[PDB]
Ligand binder design. Structure first.
Ligand SMILES: COC(=O)c1ccc(Cl)c(S(N)(=O)=O)c1
Ligand code: NA
Ligand SMILES: [Zn+2]
Length: 258
């Protein structure tokens, strides 16, 4: 009876295994655009993904991760609200059973069809597993997906998904360029938060881009053909793998713009 996204093991249940679920800086949150504070001292985000080395794509039973070689400073996030340098380790998405839901963060209560998370760890902690035990260990760049025109830089990911349909399947996945997943603007909101999945550790500086990317209905349909179950088990489509918005509590969301 491990955690997941069903009636009996989904978000409302996670606090029994992971009591920090009811903690003081949980994510995601609703971003109330009117009450976010513009902070003119926030720096432009620096996304340096030119030397990124993707290695592999994995169905982990909750999402799929595209993993990167994070053993050198090849794909790094810095600037923005951050002090220091954070290395990209993986990205993944959360998405819905329908186009009207799927994102974890919301914007004035609006749900997007999906949300991309590019996960980075602070180099001062040497690796991801040590970083997650620190309050400034991770920086996650969140990007909303709306359904409309296709995102051409996504199609390499969608095309490989049939090879990793079930939990535990992986495939080599080299030379994927995550710059093809970015919107034109790097304007962002930022706040301190947590992992959105167990163990829900309070180690994340969230950086959520204002501008969504558009993906086609065919692209998101392929995400919904994935399976949360392993091969040889009854089919449970991997859909609605999102945690709802959690209480803001004693936090202020900052804007880099307007
Ligand atoms: C199964 O998802 C994860 O274990 C996981 C690990 C790291 C992070 Cl930062 C995230 S998320 N959704 O980006 O907060 C998710
Ligand atoms: Na395919
Ligand atoms: Zn995520």
């Amino acid at each position: 009876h491990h955690w997941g996204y069903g009636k009996h093991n989904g978000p409302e249940h996670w606090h029994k295994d992971f009591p920090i679920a009811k903690g003081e800086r949980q994510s995601p949150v609703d971003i109330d655009t009117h009450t976010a504070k513009y902070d003119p001292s926030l720096k432009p985000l620096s996304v340096s993904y030119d030397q990124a080395t993707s290695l592999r794509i994995l169905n982990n039973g909750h999402a799929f991760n595209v993993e990167f070689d994070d053993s050198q400073d090849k794909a790094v996030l810095k600037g923005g609200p951050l002090d220091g340098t954070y290395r990209l380790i993986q990205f993944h998405f959360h998405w819905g059973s329908l186009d009207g839901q799927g994102s974890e963060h919301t914007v004035d209560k609006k749900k997007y069809a999906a949300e991309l998370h590019l996960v980075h760890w602070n180099t001062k902690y040497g690796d991801f597993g040590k970083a997650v035990q620190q309050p400034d260990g991770l920086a996650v760049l969140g990007i909303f997906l709306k359904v409309g025109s296709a995102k051409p830089g996504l199609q390499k990911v969608v095309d490989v998904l049939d090879s990793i349909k079930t939990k535990g399947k992986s495939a080599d996945f080299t030379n994927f360029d995550p710059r093809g997943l970015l919107p034109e603007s790097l304007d962002y909101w930022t706040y301190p938060g947590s992992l959105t999945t167990p163990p829900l550790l309070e180690c994340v500086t969230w950086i959520v881009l204002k501008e969504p990317i558009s993906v086609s209905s065919e692209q998101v349909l392929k995400f919904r053909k994935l399976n949360f179950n392993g091969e040889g088990e009854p089919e449970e489509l991997m859909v609605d793998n999102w945690r709802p918005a959690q209480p803001l509590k004693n936090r202020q969301i900052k804007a880099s713009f307007k």
